[PDB]
Amino acid sequence: MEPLYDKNGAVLFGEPSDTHPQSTLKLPHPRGEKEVIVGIRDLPRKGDCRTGNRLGPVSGLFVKPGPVFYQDYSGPVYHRAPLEQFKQAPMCEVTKRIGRVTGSDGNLYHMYVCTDGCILVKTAKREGQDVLKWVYNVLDSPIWVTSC
Ligand SMILES: [Cl-]
Numbered sequence: 001m002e003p004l005y006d007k008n009g010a011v012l013f014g015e016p017s018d019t020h021p022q023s024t025l026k027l028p029h030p031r032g033e034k035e036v037i038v039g040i041r042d043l044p045r046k047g048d049c050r051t052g053n054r055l056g057p058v059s060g061l062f063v064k065p066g067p068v069f070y071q072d073y074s075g076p077v078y079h080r081a082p083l084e085q086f087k088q089a090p091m092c093e094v095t096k097r098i099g100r101v102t103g104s105d106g107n108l109y110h111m112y113v114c115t116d117g118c119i120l121v122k123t124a125k126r127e128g129q130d131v132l133k134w135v136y137n138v139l140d141s142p143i144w145v146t147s148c
Helices: none
Strands: 036-038 058-064 068-072 084-090 094-102 109-116 119-123 131-134 142-148
Touching: 058 094, 094 142
Parallel strands: none
Antiparallel strands: 036 068, 058 068, 058 142, 084 131, 094 109, 109 119, 119 131
């Protein structure tokens, strides 16, 4: 299974892997002041990093299926999309572009939220027509999508 990581960046099982240099997740980075759930209409801004915002502290953007979005999160997270829990799908009608995530295969993906609430990834580069949806979350943990 793709490892989870604790708020200090340490792997909780398995082997650590690096994130893709072009990901919107830039490590090392702090997080986990508070768990702060946000709506899709109130995703945090890069300028909210030092100050927080009116919703609370901010370490970036985190997402899991539901969809559920967070601007900070203290528990275990993915640093890479756990592709074993994704399934091939056609491109959806996208409502929002949320970041660039490393997959558990090491590759870079663009990540989107669909009109149907599904989280979808599409390969950024190389092989054509790769597109997957996040259909299982057996550890009920979010991906750290962006760091501020
Ligand atoms: Cl997994």
